[PDB]
Ligand binder design. Structure first.
Ligand SMILES: Nc1ncnc2c1ncn2[C@@H]1O[C@H](CSCC[C@H](N)C(=O)O)[C@@H](O)[C@H]1O
Length: 245
């Protein structure tokens, strides 16, 4: 995948070159997007709009830490959609990791989560955040145990997932027509054209449920209607049945 690779570490140890090789990234000097390795973290920038700043995955601070403390945890809309209740903490597979925001919430409540991400740049950003997260003296311990990243496509990797999770969470990038962070991220990640193909394999893998995030008025994934869903402001979480063992 092409992208402008920028080194702002001053180390000269080849960290960026190793990272590009590992994720199969190709340097593109005139690319609209830039992946920058800084002394603090790996971030993504929209070169034509510096005012938007850079975005990076941070499980320890910022917005994720604020949501963990004030979001409600088991009380979150996504947590109730996955079925979290009482001492029931299902194993979850987030087939569309992205920035890992929803994944982190579920793992923070107590769920064991496996994240899948096929975009090499996104995966690189998540892996850097995970490295910093695992290193945290406070959450590093449980984070490493309840949140793992898998670089693969859920369209074909979901089938052979073992052990089978009770729930599969789906939030592919929808073709939005209607903040800074989102503008930068969406400039990289366009609509996932083959998203409708995730429902079938997801319902076969999950033993209990499949949750699909959908914005208001957006059609259900794969046009498969469902009577169950958690509704919040702006979006809803469609709930489907899985395939019991
Ligand atoms: N088959 C697939 N396998 C892995 N990742 C996939 C995928 N189809 C789409 N994706 C990823 O799914 C992500 C959805 S973006 C949503 C991010 C997430 N809801 C959050 O909490 O932030 C995108 O980054 C896209 O690259």
């Amino acid at each position: 995948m092409k992208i402008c690779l920028i080194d702002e570490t001053g180390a000269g140890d080849g960290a960026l070159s190793v990272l590009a090789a590992r994720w199969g990234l190709e340097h593109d000097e005139d690319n609209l997007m830039a992946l920058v390795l800084t002394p603090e973290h790996l971030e993504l920038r929209k070169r034509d709009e510096p005012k938007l700043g850079g975005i990076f995955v941070d499980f320890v601070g910022g917005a994720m830490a604020h949501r963990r403390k004030f979001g409600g945890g088991r009380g979150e809309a996504v947590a109730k959609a996955v079925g979290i209740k009482g001492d029931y903490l299902p194993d979850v597979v987030d087939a569309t990791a992205g920035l890992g925001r929803d994944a982190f919430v579920l793992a923070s409540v107590g769920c064991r989560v496996r994240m899948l991400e096929r975009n090499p740049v996104v995966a690189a950003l998540l892996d850097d955040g995970l490295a910093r997260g695992y290193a945290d003296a406070e959450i590093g311990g449980w984070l490493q145990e309840r949140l793992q990243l898998i670089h693969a496509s859920s369209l074909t990797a979901l089938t052979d997932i073992t052990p089978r999770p009770q729930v599969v969470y789906l939030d592919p990038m929808f073709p939005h027509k209607q903040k800074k962070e989102m503008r930068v991220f969406q400039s990289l990640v366009g609509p996932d054209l083959d998203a409708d193909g995730l429902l079938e394999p997801a319902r076969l893998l999950a033993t209990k449920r499949v949750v699909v995030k959908r914005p208001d008025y957006a059609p259900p994934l794969a046009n498969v209607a469902t009577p169950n869903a958690v509704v919040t402001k702006g979006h809803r979480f469609d709930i489907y049945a899985g395939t019991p063992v």
